Design a protein around this ligand. Structure first.
Ligand SMILES: [Mg+2]
Ligand SMILES: [Mg+2]
Ligand SMILES: [Mg+2]
Ligand SMILES: [Mg+2]
Ligand SMILES: [Mg+2]
Ligand SMILES: [Mg+2]
Ligand SMILES: [Mg+2]
Ligand SMILES: [Mg+2]
Ligand SMILES: [Mg+2]
Ligand SMILES: [Mg+2]
Lengths: 156, 131, 190
RNA sequence: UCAUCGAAUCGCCACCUACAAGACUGGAGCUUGCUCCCUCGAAGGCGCCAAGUAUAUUCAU
RNA sequence: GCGACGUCGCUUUUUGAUCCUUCGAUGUCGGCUCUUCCUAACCUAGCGCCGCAGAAGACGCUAAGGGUUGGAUUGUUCACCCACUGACAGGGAACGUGAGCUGGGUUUAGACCGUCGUGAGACAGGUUGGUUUUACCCUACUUAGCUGGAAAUUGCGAGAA
RNA sequence: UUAGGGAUAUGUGGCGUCAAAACUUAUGGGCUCAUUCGAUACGUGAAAAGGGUGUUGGUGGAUAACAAAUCCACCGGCCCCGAAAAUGGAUGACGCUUAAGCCCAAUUAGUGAUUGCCCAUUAUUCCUUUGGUAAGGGCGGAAACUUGGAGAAAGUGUAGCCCUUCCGAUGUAGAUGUGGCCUGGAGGUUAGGACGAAGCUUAUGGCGUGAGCCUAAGAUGGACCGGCCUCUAGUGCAGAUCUUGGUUGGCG
RNA sequence: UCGAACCACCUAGUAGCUGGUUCACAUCGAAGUUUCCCUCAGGAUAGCUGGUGCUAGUAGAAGUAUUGUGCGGUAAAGC
RNA sequence: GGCCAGAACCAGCCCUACUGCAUUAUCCUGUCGGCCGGCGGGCAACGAAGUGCAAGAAUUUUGGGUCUUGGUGAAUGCUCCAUGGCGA
């Protein structure tokens, strides 16, 4: 019995995680800049990375306002974003995680895209059975209206 | 998440009917439990002090608190036994967060490559490294 | 156990252009062209700019993952060099009594009256490796292989020395065979 | 002689999943494939029962 | 190439033990016949290597694929010679193989001899003469037919290289 | 470690499929490539030195030059060879190798202190039996909304005198008990039978843990016989190369 | 039928040997050891076990420890 | 009567939130530099756990007769009276 993401929709796929990871050298991906964690008990949060300790393991934190502690989260559920603060080209791994994040790099990302999908899938998990109707009359609307537009294309 | 907490176990030798005030022995051991700390408390004193767990009493075993969770270096002078080259010590400088964390990696490395497990392994000098 | 050592770099001058597409390498020049494959563990080939630098980084490393990096460095430079300079291959022989003949016919090679074997010993050569003889008079002996690619002309300037041996016989007292001679990097300014 | 078990359906699936162009201009699009879920679309408008609280859906190819 | 000195792994067509199975019966060696299997390679086959110039041997490795005889004496296995041959390698299969053959050796009841024993008799000492039953049953194999069969005989059960 | 059942939970062993359980764990630390990898003890032992110019670990001691690093010696295996047989061939099978191998750990994921999960004739609990002679209490008439019993009889034993309570419950040789089963016959009693007895048949049910009993229905049978208390013995059969009779396969 | 015929009888000869020995449930439930035996394929005797018990029996209880108090000469050691 | 479903008290397995409850040190400052040494006062405990009290409330299962009742203000006591809903 297959849940699908096409192509090649998948048998026997647990709906509580994925084996996303493809191996990469640690240094290029991340450097005490910023990252987000897919699979954590706190779910899909982003915390700027304080430092790298050993290999897979990282120390991941965030200033406040998210109930995110300074903690040891592993790269196996911690995946970089290109909204860095202190990785790569910028001269150093920075300190004062709030002030460096007071450069709105998180505030910009939290209001930019790929975070409107984080809460999208978290909205479809808190949508009670009334907004699921709202979502179905919303798709059904855009659906047939799409068909009306196709009819217009046929006319053209 | 790393097992094998760090215990501070201290104890006299049941004072005494002979010496009436035997010197107190304290040492810090990494162990899953504190029953396993006292079990290896009374192995040092049975060996390094010739004191039985029977003829002595444990004063106050204690769980060391923590260090502010932040990555740092650790050289752990570790001494294991094996039919694989009996009683060799080692250094194996690890880079983990806490002493509990790095010594965990120490055990999971020896049991990984020398198959030496918890009771065949003594630990000494779990200290840190600036550079 | 596992560590990292360094990174490998090659510069790509004018007259030589390298691609990175399907992680494969294309090197061309003004004397010849050649393309091949260089995959391995942790060895992802990425060329930064079209004529700036051939870089091959690996992120993991051990004795085996690192004894395989700079061999592509040994096998990318000779791509860039063979397309501009090229390395010629020469072959010699010796005799005591047997007067001989040899032949090369377009795309194949003949070896007749070898040691007394009055038949032909064929061997296929790829598309673009052209060769002649100097049996006429002045050299009388040599077979000079030319071309562009390091290992696509070395691969067959290896078998004529495999097509040679005299087997159930003392070997040192006499030297039957037109065998590969003097591995050499022949350049030219004539 | 059939009363059946089953319970999304495809000209938007279904070469390819991934190209092309960033160690800092975004590309995306060779896409969480569509559409499906109560009147062909959102704003209504409409009949439903007495099959009398569950009972294989008394439907449906 | 092995040899002092030595040792250390693995070996059964081994010398014996063990007494575990069999005493209301697993019928005795050897052959004949036929099939198989293994390589620790005897031959051919593949290079290799030497004081391997040709010749011709020399050492070695890889390979079980193919091949490995005919006789004399012996019941023999083995052994020995004879002769051919490229060479006549070594083993397993219940010391492969008797409801397949043979019956020469073991083989009893007759008899003779040698030693032993007072004697009857004994000898794993010699010699000679001395039963060899049954498939018509099940499977195995070998050929020879027949007939069902796809929810492998059934649901209507629905999948077309 | 064992009465008959249900549930909860474990033990040993496990959780890729067979196979219940990580629908292949969000697993974590390293190790491992093995041209017969390796992988559950005790099965019997698997492999012995030996080395290397091999992959990973550790200690003694140089250079600041190998052909900005590069050495001289060894300790430690995983792993390579050392090492081999005879039907085809075994981790148990497939298969696994960025594990489903090995050694360590884990148990909801560094968020905050528990039982990840699956399997028993075990444990806990619940009913039911049965024994203990195990304890009790009644051991002749009253009421809680519907009946049952704190009214069923002074009792080893049952269709228990009635409740309810605890505990135990396997078992060969053996022992013992049974208000226990059965066959032939006797003494008693009660009773059937031509309106169909014994017998016999069984998809005839029921009821007893069982031995067995009772019923029905015979398009069976034709004239004897059941229950109960004692008595009695030529009293229970699957197995003795049983005995006798009969049949049967092989078998047209 | 003959290393002692055949028939009938003693005779149902004897067998520490082989084979068999007919219902249920319940309650319990072992031993292959001791000593003696022309004994070692068997017996007898203890032990194990059952039944019936008798008897005033938290005791004359214990495959257990503690406490004292004895004992010993194996391991290790030492030549 | 048999077949179900639901409900309700009983006990049972329980859902478990907040978790408080004390302790312990964690940690609060000072100027130093890409080999780091020049240290003291507990007055803070939400990521201190070898540790104490929790029902209402979640679940099927199983059994149902000697009842229930009303709250008081202190430093918990008087007490009174006699299953239903389907299908077949
Ligand atoms: Mg024979
Ligand atoms: Mg002959
Ligand atoms: Mg047959
Ligand atoms: Mg269960
Ligand atoms: Mg792993
Ligand atoms: Mg009689
Ligand atoms: Mg009789
Ligand atoms: Mg009979
Ligand atoms: Mg019979
Ligand atoms: Mg001694």
């Amino acid at each position: 019995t297959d849940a699908y993401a096409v192509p090649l929709s998948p048998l026997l796929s647990c709906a509580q995680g994925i084996a996303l990871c493809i191996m990469v050298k640690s240094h290029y991906i991340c450097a005490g800049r910023l990252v987000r964690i897919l699979r954590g008990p706190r779910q899909d949060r982003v915390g700027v990375i304080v430092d790298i300790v050993d290999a897979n393991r990282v120390l991941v934190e965030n200033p406040e306002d998210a109930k995110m502690w300074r903690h040891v989260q592993n790269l196996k559920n911690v995946e970089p974003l290109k909204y860095c603060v202190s990785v790569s080209r910028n001269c150093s791994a920075k300190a004062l995680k709030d002030a460096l994040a007071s450069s709105k790099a998180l505030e910009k990302y939290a209001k930019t895209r790929t975070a409107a999908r984080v809460e999208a899938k978290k909205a479809c998990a808190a949508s009670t059975d009334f907004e699921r109707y709202q979502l179905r009359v919303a798709r059904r609307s855009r659906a047939h209206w799409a068909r009306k537009v196709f009819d217009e294309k046929d006319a053209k | 998440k790393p097992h094998l907490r760090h215990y501070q176990v201290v104890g006299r030798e049941s004072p005494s009917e002979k010496n009436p005030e035997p010197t107190v022995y304290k040492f810090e051991v990494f162990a899953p439990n504190f029953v396993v700390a006292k079990s290896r408390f009374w192995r040092m004193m049975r060996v390094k002090n010739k004191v039985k767990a029977t003829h002595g009493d444990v004063l106050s075993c204690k769980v060391v608190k923590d260090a502010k969770l932040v990555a740092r270096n650790y050289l752990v002078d570790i001494a294991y036994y094996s039919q694989r080259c009996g009683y060799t010590r080692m250094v194996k400088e690890f880079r983990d967060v806490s002493k509990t964390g790095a010594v965990s990696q120490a055990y999971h490395d020896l049991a990984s490559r020398h198959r030496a497990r918890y009771h065949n392994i003594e630990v000494l000098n779990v200290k840190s490294i600036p550079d | 156990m596992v560590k990292v050592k360094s990174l490998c770099t090659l510069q790509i001058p004018e007259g030589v252009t390298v691609d990175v597409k399907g992680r494969k390498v294309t090197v061309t020049g003004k004397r010849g062209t050649l393309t091949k494959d260089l995959t391995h563990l942790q060895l992802d080939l990425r060329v930064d700019k079209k004529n700036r630098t051939f870089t091959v980084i690996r992120w993991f490393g051990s004795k085996i993952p690192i004894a395989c990096l700079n061999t592509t460095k040994a096998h990318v430079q000779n791509m860039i060099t063979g397309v501009t300079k090229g390395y010629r291959f020469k072959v010699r022989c010796a005799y005591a009594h047997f007067p001989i003949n040899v032949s090369v016919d377009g795309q194949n090679i003949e070896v007749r009256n070898f040691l007394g074997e009055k038949r032909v010993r064929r061997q296929l050569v790829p598309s673009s490796v052209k060769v002649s003889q100097t049996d006429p008079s002045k050299v009388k002996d040599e077979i000079i292989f030319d071309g562009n690619d390091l290992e696509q002309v070395s691969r067959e300037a290896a078998v004529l020395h495999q097509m040679c041996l005299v087997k159930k016989k003392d070997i040192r007292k006499f030297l039957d065979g037109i065998y590969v001679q003097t591995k050499t990097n022949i350049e030219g300014m004539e």
